[PDB]
Design an enzyme around this catalytic site. Structure first.
Site, PDB file in Angstrom:
ATOM      1  N   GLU B  65      58.232  36.181  39.362  1.00 31.16           N
ATOM      2  CA  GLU B  65      58.864  35.871  40.567  1.00 31.16           C
ATOM      3  C   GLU B  65      58.306  34.721  40.964  1.00 31.16           C
ATOM      4  OE1 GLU B  65      58.989  38.811  43.915  1.00 31.16           O
ATOM      5  OE2 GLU B  65      57.148  39.780  43.005  1.00 31.16           O
ATOM      6  N   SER B 134      47.294  44.209  41.296  1.00 30.67           N
ATOM      7  CA  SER B 134      47.408  45.534  41.856  1.00 30.67           C
ATOM      8  C   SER B 134      47.748  46.534  40.996  1.00 30.67           C
ATOM      9  CB  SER B 134      48.603  45.440  42.794  1.00 30.67           C
ATOM     10  OG  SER B 134      49.865  45.377  42.092  1.00 30.67           O
ATOM     11  N   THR B 139      55.015  44.165  37.907  1.00 26.80           N
ATOM     12  CA  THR B 139      54.493  43.157  37.348  1.00 26.80           C
ATOM     13  C   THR B 139      52.880  43.426  37.063  1.00 26.80           C
ATOM     14  OG1 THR B 139      55.858  41.328  37.795  1.00 26.80           O
ATOM     15  CG2 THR B 139      53.679  40.834  37.344  1.00 26.80           C
ATOM     16  N   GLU B 248      25.187  42.912  32.700  1.00 29.25           N
ATOM     17  CA  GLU B 248      24.377  44.036  33.215  1.00 29.25           C
ATOM     18  C   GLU B 248      25.215  44.959  34.019  1.00 29.25           C
ATOM     19  OE1 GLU B 248      20.648  42.814  34.086  1.00 29.25           O
ATOM     20  OE2 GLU B 248      20.805  40.758  33.597  1.00 29.25           O
TER      21      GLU B 248
HETATM   22  N1  LIG Z   1      44.943  43.798  49.326  1.00 31.86           N
HETATM   23  C1  LIG Z   1      46.475  43.272  49.151  1.00 31.86           C
HETATM   24  N2  LIG Z   1      47.223  44.010  48.613  1.00 31.86           N
HETATM   25  C2  LIG Z   1      48.621  43.509  48.538  1.00 31.86           C
HETATM   26  C3  LIG Z   1      48.650  42.233  49.211  1.00 31.86           C
HETATM   27  N3  LIG Z   1      49.871  41.832  49.202  1.00 31.86           N
HETATM   28  C4  LIG Z   1      50.561  42.889  48.212  1.00 31.86           C
HETATM   29  N4  LIG Z   1      49.678  43.743  48.009  1.00 31.86           N
HETATM   30  C5  LIG Z   1      49.722  44.804  47.258  1.00 31.86           C
HETATM   31  O1  LIG Z   1      50.884  44.767  46.430  1.00 31.86           O
HETATM   32  C6  LIG Z   1      51.565  46.031  46.038  1.00 31.86           C
HETATM   33  C7  LIG Z   1      53.094  45.766  45.967  1.00 31.86           C
HETATM   34  O2  LIG Z   1      53.293  45.574  44.405  1.00 31.86           O
HETATM   35  P1  LIG Z   1      52.650  43.959  43.510  1.00 31.86           P
HETATM   36  O3  LIG Z   1      51.715  44.458  42.744  1.00 31.86           O
HETATM   37  O4  LIG Z   1      52.564  42.896  44.723  1.00 31.86           O
HETATM   38  O5  LIG Z   1      54.197  43.778  43.072  1.00 31.86           O
HETATM   39  P2  LIG Z   1      54.252  42.348  42.587  1.00 31.86           P
HETATM   40  O6  LIG Z   1      52.901  41.761  42.455  1.00 31.86           O
HETATM   41  O7  LIG Z   1      55.080  41.621  43.494  1.00 31.86           O
HETATM   42  O8  LIG Z   1      54.757  42.291  41.167  1.00 31.86           O
HETATM   43  P3  LIG Z   1      56.343  43.252  40.940  1.00 31.86           P
HETATM   44  O9  LIG Z   1      56.101  44.636  40.910  1.00 31.86           O
HETATM   45  O10 LIG Z   1      56.959  42.797  39.707  1.00 31.86           O
HETATM   46  O11 LIG Z   1      57.354  42.649  42.089  1.00 31.86           O
HETATM   47  C8  LIG Z   1      51.495  46.797  47.487  1.00 31.86           C
HETATM   48  O12 LIG Z   1      51.032  48.103  47.135  1.00 31.86           O
HETATM   49  C9  LIG Z   1      50.184  46.084  47.968  1.00 31.86           C
HETATM   50  O13 LIG Z   1      49.076  46.921  48.371  1.00 31.86           O
HETATM   51  C10 LIG Z   1      47.687  41.551  49.873  1.00 31.86           C
HETATM   52  O14 LIG Z   1      47.853  40.568  50.431  1.00 31.86           O
HETATM   53  N5  LIG Z   1      46.418  41.967  50.100  1.00 31.86           N
HETATM   54 MG   LIG Z   2      56.161  41.027  42.089  1.00 29.01          MG
END
Ligand SMILES: Nc1nc2c(ncn2[C@@H]2O[C@H](COP(=O)(O)OP(=O)(O)OP(=O)(O)O)[C@@H](O)[C@H]2O)c(=O)[nH]1
Ligand SMILES: [Mg+2]
Ligand SMILES: Nc1nc2c(ncn2[C@@H]2O[C@H](COP(=O)(O)OP(=O)(O)O)[C@@H](O)[C@H]2O)c(=O)[nH]1
Ligand SMILES: [Zn+2]
Lengths: 429, 435, 332
Positions: B65, B134, B139, B248
């Protein structure tokens, strides 16, 4: 004559070597640039034993610095007393041993050991009459352990007559700076008891204890521990780098301290050790040094000598002193601690005396005790190894580089045999 | 000459990377435009250099995206990154694993691999990979699984480190988190050398209690995780009295091929007003690291055993104090390692103190310590996910999306079997040995 | 069992089946063979052969076939998930949660084997034929008996070979496997000792018979060829050329132990017997003065001791091993 070649493997080996060459250069009055600015000809009368006189009247240490990661190498290179090593010596790789012994002895080391041996051979042919090799390395770190064992095996193949010295930093009993250090220790000890003449066991725990209690320092940086080990090594070699009323060489120590081919592990010790304030409130006499050198609280190996017996003991003094005084002290200390020495080795104190103090002091002393107490050390490590082998933990990292279990089985059996030999000779009659 | 590239997948990865590269550019005195007005080289390991005084990061920001990547291109860090790397898709996986691993990501995986290969071949002493991704997002899970399989195929034996965002036990922004988590774990279980468990809930807790901020944005969690990453890489990027490389890490913290999920922890974390009123002993900060309330994963360590620990210190640290503190920690009973691992520590010391980002929340400290700890408590967490999965699979909920997007039910059953096997292995290791 | 599990068992099984049960398996083993243990168990006993057949016939009289007995009393075949669930519940019930590694395998000649892999306890459970009401029993056998006895024994002066000699201990068996077998069928509604009885019987015949003959002989009690193959191999463990008569008599220990323990149940202190470790029921009075019993563990199913004894009575009744018959069997 009797030139000695210095090898430095592993990060600890390289740092110790940096401090060691600082100490030696301070001894012979060598500027950081590598040119002599000293004042006493005796410095240069044997300057060749560790240095080579390069043209335009400069001096280069006979060092061979080895590693698998350019980090500490570059740290040495940038820092002072680094600008005099011959730049072609700095052999280093890119992969890094990754704190693994399999990498340090089979996979990664097999690619640099050839260049290392070539520079070794060049230096050997450069020397007039080679005396022996001193290897400064660890036993935990992958590079140190693996590559040092490989180099020792290869050198012993190419020079079965020279003498071999190792300053191996044994893992401490209480703390464990690494996680897989029992494996590295066992394999390295297997190789060493195979092909080494003498091994100077050291623990960081004992050095911590000495810097804390005896020196009254609450902030012991690694510089200080390396400084202590460097002073010990300088004391070992001054018997031939300098004149003396009763001189010694490395071969003399090897003959005196090694009754049997395998049992050649020594714990060192140094004296005097005085804090900054508590110095003027003590007399610097030979009896004081001698009584200082015999106690658990001044052995650089973490094991009480009282738990076993001194198989043999060597003692190298420095500075001007009286031989009769030393003889009397050794007689007294051999008399009162009769249960602390082995019965069947009468007069088991080798003595050597130099003529130059280690700078600043009036008289110093270095102790090299080959005892049976060290068996505990191996015992400890052996047990640890056994535990970590019973579950075959971490085994896959070592298996993936070609090594297999039978290697570990044989190495553990060999170490247990060595401990059995130490036990047998401890209670011999 | 020890290079290490960074790969950011998904929105979480991209924002965490924003924070991380802000931190780096602050550390080495690097302007946002790559210019720069104890240091060595240092930055060479993460920054490549062009002819001018302009340095560029070795990062590959990939997403399906274009929103967040466009924000990056428009942010203050526009001049920095090499514009070819900012790979953007067209339609995100929309929290669907199948889309992120079979349908959509399958059409830019090749471009991503191509940029990876270019960046790798421009380097000489490549150390390994840092995947910032994540676990719940479509994605993240799908694309990361695909990318890890591809890289493991290409680069046979090299370090591969992940920073997953473990799904919290009670706060879940997504609804299909169990599916994505189980699938991506079943895939990455055979390729990732060492993951790094972190959760948002624990960081919320830490921000509220320790830093005394009651209303934190994702910026704050990102800054904390960036600090953790910087402490991990400070060994490569700086001169230290006892350095350590990523190989390590994988050697020390991974006893068995499968059990490679260590959780992170950082200390000290204290507000500027509370910066005084405590001298911050290295023994004190060690105790803080082992405090069950300071871990960054919602799992009580007391319910499991620390199979391994790796503490990386930085700043004005002295090894004797570290030895004493670790000895004390080993003395106590509530911190009980496994019997079969008597040596449960790797120690690393760096000379460079952590640097505080202006406009940040933490206080200028002289000593810092990051603990990466592989324990057995995390096993229970898997159970929770397993449990969730079971329920959401007992009714075949949401199954139609995955089925119609290039996947089969037998795959779900197989992944469930694999997760059960992993839980079994954790339980088996947790027991003691006889004789 | 690892050492006496033939290295070519599969290739010889296919041969046997494909010849329509006429071929005699020519087994081979991992060298060297444990000659001492083979010789120790080279002769079969017939002391309790009529008790074995008594139990077998009691089952077949009530259930017609073993096939129906198994399904009716055993419950459903279990999935891996269900096995783990039952095991986890058991470990917690026994207070030994987190002590034992659990493994699932298809290549076990029994339901389960308690081991010491990596110098640590390991419970290997056969997923092939694991059943609901039966699995709980297996856990009472391996964990409730073998494991708890083992841990208790490690705390005793006779924890090793020397200690056994010094304190003059009779062998642990048959008391060990006798106790374990009784415990397997403890809380069952129809606690028939089928496995024990059929093992005893099969060994008795194995001593006289070739493999072919033994396999055919068993048809009268159990139809399933796979089940019969298991019992035959167990009875002929160590035999190379199975065309000749001969047996490994070890598995007779189960029934042998059962009969003896039941016979003397009134004079046995079962908590104490478990607390003293790997000891014979006969050594209890001898060893009681020298046992260290502070932190020894007794199984959960022995806490209500009154109920435990009732179960033993129920087990006798069910298996046609009434007091009077045990009395005549062993006039001790
Ligand atoms: N630690 C942290 N986690 C984040 C942040 N922004 C989003 N997340 C994590 O992102 C998760 C949402 O799914 P994403 O991995 O962001 O999905 P995406 O990266 O937009 O990719 P798609 O699933 O295709 O939409 C949530 O569970 C959050 O924990 C951030 O700024 N800091
Ligand atoms: Mg996404
Ligand atoms: N005495 C001393 N020992 C050190 C020093 N630095 C590291 N060590 C020891 O060296 C070991 C680490 O080995 P190292 O050479 O760094 O790892 P390698 O690259 O795999 O060989 C640790 O067990 C430390 O105890 C030092 O400055 N002085
Ligand atoms: Zn049994």
């Amino acid at each position: 004559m009797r030139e000695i070649v210095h090898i430095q493997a592993g990060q600890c080996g390289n740092q110790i070597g940096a401090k060691f060459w600082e100490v030696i250069s301070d001894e012979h009055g060598i500027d950081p640039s590598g040119n002599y600015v000293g004042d006493s000809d005796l410095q240069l009368e044997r300057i060749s034993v560790y240095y080579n006189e390069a043209s335009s009247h400069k001096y280069v240490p006979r060092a061979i610095l080895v590693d698998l990661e350019p980090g500490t190498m570059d740290s040495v290179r940038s820092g002072a007393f680094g600008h005099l090593f011959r730049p072609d010596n700095f052999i280093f790789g890119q992969s890094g041993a990754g704190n693994n012994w399999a990498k340090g002895h089979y996979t990664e080391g097999a690619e640099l050991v050839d260049s290392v041996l070539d520079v070794v051979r060049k230096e050997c042919e450069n020397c007039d009459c080679l005396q022996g090799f001193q290897l400064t390395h660890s036993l935990g770190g992958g590079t140190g352990s693996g590559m040092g064992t490989l180099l020792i095996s290869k050198v012993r193949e190419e020079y079965p007559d020279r003498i071999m010295n190792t300053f191996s930093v044994v893992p401490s009993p209480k703390v464990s700076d690494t996680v897989v250090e029992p494996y590295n220790a066992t394999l390295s000890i297997h190789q060493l008891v195979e092909n080494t003449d003498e091994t100077y066991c050291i623990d960081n725990e004992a050095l911590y204890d000495i810097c804390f209690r005896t020196l009254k320092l609450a902030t012991p940086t690694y510089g200080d521990l390396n400084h202590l080990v460097s002073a010990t090594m300088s004391g070992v070699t001054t018997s031939l780098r300098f004149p003396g009323q009763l001189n010694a060489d490395l071969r003399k120590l090897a003959v005196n301290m090694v009754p049997f081919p395998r049992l050649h592990f020594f714990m060192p010790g140094f004296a005097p050790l005085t804090a900054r304030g508590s110095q003027q409130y003590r007399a610097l006499t030979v009896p004081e040094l001698t009584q200082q050198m015999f106690d658990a609280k001044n052995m650089m190996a973490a094991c009480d000598p009282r738990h076993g017996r001194y198989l043999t003991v060597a003692t190298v003094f420095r500075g001007r002193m009286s031989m009769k005084e030393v003889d009397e002290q050794m007689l007294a200390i051999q008399s009162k601690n009769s249960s602390y020495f082995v019965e069947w080795i009468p007069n088991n104190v080798k003595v050597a005396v130099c003529d130059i103090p280690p700078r600043g002091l009036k008289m110093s002393s270095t102790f090299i005790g080959n005892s049976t107490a060290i068996q505990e050390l191996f015992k400890r490590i052996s047990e640890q190894f056994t535990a970590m082998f019973r579950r075959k933990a971490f085994l896959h990292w070592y298996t993936g580089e070609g090594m297999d279990e039978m290697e570990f089985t044989e190495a553990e059996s060999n170490m247990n045999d060595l401990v059995s030999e130490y036990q047998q000779y401890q209670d011999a009659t | 000459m020890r290079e290490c590239i960074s790969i950011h997948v998904g929105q979480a990865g991209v924002q965490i990377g924003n924070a991380c590269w802000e931190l780096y550019c602050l550390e080495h005195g690097i302007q946002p435009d790559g210019q720069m007005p104890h240091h060595h080289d240092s930055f060479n390991t993460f920054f490549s250099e062009t002819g001018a005084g302009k340095h560029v990061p070795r990062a590959v920001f990939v997403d399906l995206e274009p929103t967040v990547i466009d924000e990056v291109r428009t942010g203050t860090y526009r001049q920095l990154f090499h514009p070819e790397q900012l790979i953007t898709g067209k339609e995100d996986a929309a929290n669907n694993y199948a889309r992120g691993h079979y349908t959509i990501g399958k059409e830019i995986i090749d471009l991503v691999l191509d940029r990876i290969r270019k960046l790798a071949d421009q380097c000489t002493g490549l150390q390994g990979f840092l995947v910032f991704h994540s676990f719940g997002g479509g994605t993240g899970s799908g694309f990361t699984s695909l990318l890890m399989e591809r890289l493991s195929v290409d680069y046979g034996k090299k370090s591969k480190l992940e920073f997953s965002i473990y799904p919290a036990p009670q706060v879940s922004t997504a609804v299909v988190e169990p599916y994505n988590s189980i699938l991506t774990t079943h895939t990455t279980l055979e390729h990732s050398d060492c993951a790094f468990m972190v959760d948002n809930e624990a960081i919320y807790d830490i921000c509220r209690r320790n830093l005394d901020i009651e209303r934190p944005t994702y910026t704050n969690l990102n800054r904390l995780i960036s600090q953790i990453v910087s402490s991990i890489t400070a060994s490569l990027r700086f001169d230290g009295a006892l350095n350590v490389d990523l190989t390590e890490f994988q050697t020390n913290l991974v006893p068995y091929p499968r059990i490679h999920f260590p959780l992170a922890t950082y200390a000290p974390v204290i507000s500027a007003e509370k910066a005084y009123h405590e001298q911050l002993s290295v023994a004190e900060i060690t105790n803080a690291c082992f405090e069950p309330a300071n871990q960054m994963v919602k799992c009580d360590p007391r319910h499991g055993k620390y199979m391994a620990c790796c503490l990386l210190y930085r700043g004005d640290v002295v090894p004797k104090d570290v030895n004493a503190a670790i000895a004390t920690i080993k003395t106590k009973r509530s911190i009980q390692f496994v019997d079969w691992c008597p040596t449960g520590f790797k120690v690393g010391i760096n000379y460079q103190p952590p640097t505080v980002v202006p406009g940040g929340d933490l206080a200028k400290v002289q000593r810092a310590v990051c603990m990466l700890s592989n324990t057995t408590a995390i096993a229970e967490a898997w159970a929770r996910l397993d449990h969730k999965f079971d329920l959401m699979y007992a009714k075949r909920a949401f199954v139609h999306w995955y089925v119609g997007e290039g996947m089969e039910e037998g795959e779900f059953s197989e992944a469930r079997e694999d997760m059960a096997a992993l839980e079994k292995d954790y339980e088996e290791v947790g027991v003691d040995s006889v004789e | 069992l690892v050492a006496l599990r033939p290295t070519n068992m599969d290739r010889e099984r296919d041969k046997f089946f494909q010849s329509h049960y006429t071929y005699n398996p020519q087994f081979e083993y991992q060298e060297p063979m444990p000659t001492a243990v083979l010789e120790k168990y080279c002769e079969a006993s017939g002391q309790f052969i009529h008790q074995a057949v008594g139990i077998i016939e009691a089952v077949l009289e009530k259930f017609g076939t073993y096939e129906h007995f198994e399904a009716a009393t055993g419950g459903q075949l279990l999935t891996k998930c269900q096995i783990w669930s039952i095991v986890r519940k058991y470990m917690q019930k026994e207070g030994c949660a987190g002590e034992v590694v659990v493994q699932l395998s298809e290549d076990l000649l029994s339901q389960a084997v308690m081991m010491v892999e990596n110098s640590r306890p390991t419970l290997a459970i056969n997923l092939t034929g694991a059943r609901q009401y039966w699995l709980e029993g297996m856990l009472r056998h391996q964990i409730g008996t073998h494991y708890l006895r083992g841990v208790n024994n490690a705390r005793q002066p006779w924890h090793n070979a020397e200690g056994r000699l010094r304190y003059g201990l009779r062998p642990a068996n048959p008391t060990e496997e006798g106790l374990a077998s009784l415990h397997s069928v403890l809380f069952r509604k129809q606690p028939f000792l089928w496995r024990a009885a059929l093992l005893y019987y099969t060994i008795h015949r194995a001593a006289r018979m070739s493999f072919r003959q033994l396999f055919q002989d068993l048809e009268r009690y159990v139809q399933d060829a796979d089940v019969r193959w298991e019992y035959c191999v167990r009875a002929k463990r160590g035999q190379t050329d199975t065309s000749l008569p001969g047996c490994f008599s070890k598995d007779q220990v189960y029934l042998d132990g059962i009969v003896r323990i039941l016979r003397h149940r009134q004079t046995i202190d079962f908590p104490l017997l478990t607390s003293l470790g790997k000891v014979s029921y006969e050594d209890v009075d001898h060893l009681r003065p020298h046992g260290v019993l502070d932190n020894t563990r007794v199984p959960h199913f022995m806490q209500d001791l009154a109920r435990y004894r009732q179960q033993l009575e129920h087990i006798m009744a069910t298996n046609r091993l009434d007091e009077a018959e045990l009395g005549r069997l062993l006039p001790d």
